[PDB]
Design an enzyme around this catalytic site. Structure first.
Site, PDB file in Angstrom:
ATOM      1  N   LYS A  39       0.870  -1.149   0.000  1.00 54.14           N
ATOM      2  CA  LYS A  39       0.000   0.000   0.000  1.00 54.14           C
ATOM      3  C   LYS A  39       0.923   1.220   0.000  1.00 54.14           C
ATOM      4  O   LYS A  39       2.102   1.064   0.296  1.00 54.14           O
ATOM      5  CB  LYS A  39      -0.934   0.020   1.213  1.00 54.14           C
ATOM      6  CG  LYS A  39      -0.229  -0.067   2.539  1.00 54.14           C
ATOM      7  CD  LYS A  39      -1.224  -0.136   3.684  1.00 54.14           C
ATOM      8  CE  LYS A  39      -0.464  -0.242   4.984  1.00 54.14           C
ATOM      9  NZ  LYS A  39      -1.327   0.063   6.160  1.00 54.14           N
ATOM     10  N   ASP A  51       8.259  -2.703   5.637  1.00 52.02           N
ATOM     11  CA  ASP A  51       7.257  -3.319   6.533  1.00 52.02           C
ATOM     12  C   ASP A  51       6.893  -4.739   6.154  1.00 52.02           C
ATOM     13  O   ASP A  51       5.902  -4.994   5.456  1.00 52.02           O
ATOM     14  CB  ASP A  51       5.971  -2.495   6.670  1.00 52.02           C
ATOM     15  CG  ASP A  51       5.144  -2.941   7.855  1.00 52.02           C
ATOM     16  OD1 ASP A  51       5.457  -3.985   8.468  1.00 52.02           O
ATOM     17  OD2 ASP A  51       4.207  -2.224   8.215  1.00 52.02           O
TER      18      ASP A  51
END
Length: 299
Positions: A137, A157
């Site tokens: 994202k 991440d």
């Protein structure tokens, strides 16, 4: 595993803060080089609802230890004490890609693909090692340094990332509804394909400044994703090429088995034009920057 991070690092300012993790800039004493320290709180007892389990921390560490590619964040060191596991990670100093892009006057699709291709190469490397990221994202697409002529993308991440296990289906509720594939929405078997859907969502927003599936409620969003209910509205896509829409269309596909793979995405003519006419279509076409800026400012 090493113990006292304060003996080896000077820790500085907070860079961000998530669920059970805080990230601070740090400087290694022996080399004087800068890193990001990600402090992850361990779950103290089985019954506790604060902290991350041993299994989940060790999975993230195991995957990070594996990864060495210029478009993916790299692990420098791991420390652990009674309360935390501390990941010393490559410093990604340039902020989120979308914040950088929102400061430009314009963005041609040719310019846009120069960044998107780096994301595709990072995912290509991951999928080639059978790693699904599972949380692609905009906020996980960062820049190493915003002050160079051709900034380098870093995917960050790996808190949700999984090595695909051929012999067992993986299913789980995770991620942000507007960015996850129908199989996540529907609790169906997950694999590398889910990342490809999320790339399609990222690409759609990059070009239009609008989220394709986002509804007024979580439930509406889930329903839009499952139904693959989206469109290319003229208001948002007026200067968008047919190649770009075809690239997005091939990614936003319900059946994972029919969705474009990472290797085929890199061969798609929007990314790798086959003739001069295709290339000129990508150079002339542009993002809807006034609406893109609004998207970035709103979040």
């Amino acid at each position: 595993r090493q113990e006292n991070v304060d003996d080896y690092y000077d820790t500085g300012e907070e860079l961000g803060s998530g669920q059970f993790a805080v990230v601070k800039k740090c400087r290694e004493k022996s080399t004087g080089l800068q890193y990001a320290a990600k402090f992850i709180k361990k779950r103290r007892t089985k019954s506790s609802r604060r902290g991350v389990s041993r299994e989940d921390i060790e999975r993230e560490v195991s995957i990070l230890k594996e990864i060495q590619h210029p478009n993916v964040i790299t692990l420098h060191e791991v420390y652990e004490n009674k309360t935390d596991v501390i990941l010393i990670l490559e410093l990604v100093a340039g902020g989120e890609l979308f914040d950088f892009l929102a400061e430009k006057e314009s963005l041609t699709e040719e310019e846009a693909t120069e960044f998107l291709k780096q994301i595709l190469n990072g995912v290509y490397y991951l999928h080639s090692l059978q790693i699904a990221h599972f949380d692609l994202k905009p906020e996980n697409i960062m820049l190493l340094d915003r002050n160079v002529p051709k900034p380098r993308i870093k995917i960050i991440d790996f808190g949700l990332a999984h090595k695909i296990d051929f012999g067992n289906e993986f299913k789980n509720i995770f991620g942000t509804p507007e960015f996850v594939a129908p199989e996540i929405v529907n609790y169906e078997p997950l694999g590398l394909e889910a990342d490809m859907w999320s790339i399609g969502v990222i690409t759609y927003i990059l070009l239009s400044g609008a989220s394709p599936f986002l509804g007024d409620t979580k439930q509406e969003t889930l329903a839009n994703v499952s139904a693959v209910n989206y469109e290319f509205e003229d208001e948002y896509f007026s200067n968008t090429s047919a190649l770009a829409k075809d690239f997005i269309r091939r990614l936003l596909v319900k059946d994972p088995k029919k969705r474009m793979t990472i290797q085929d995405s890199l061969q798609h003519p929007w990314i790798k034009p086959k003739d001069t006419q295709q290339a000129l279509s990508r150079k002339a076409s542009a993002v809807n920057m006034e609406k893109f800026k609004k998207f970035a400012a709103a979040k």
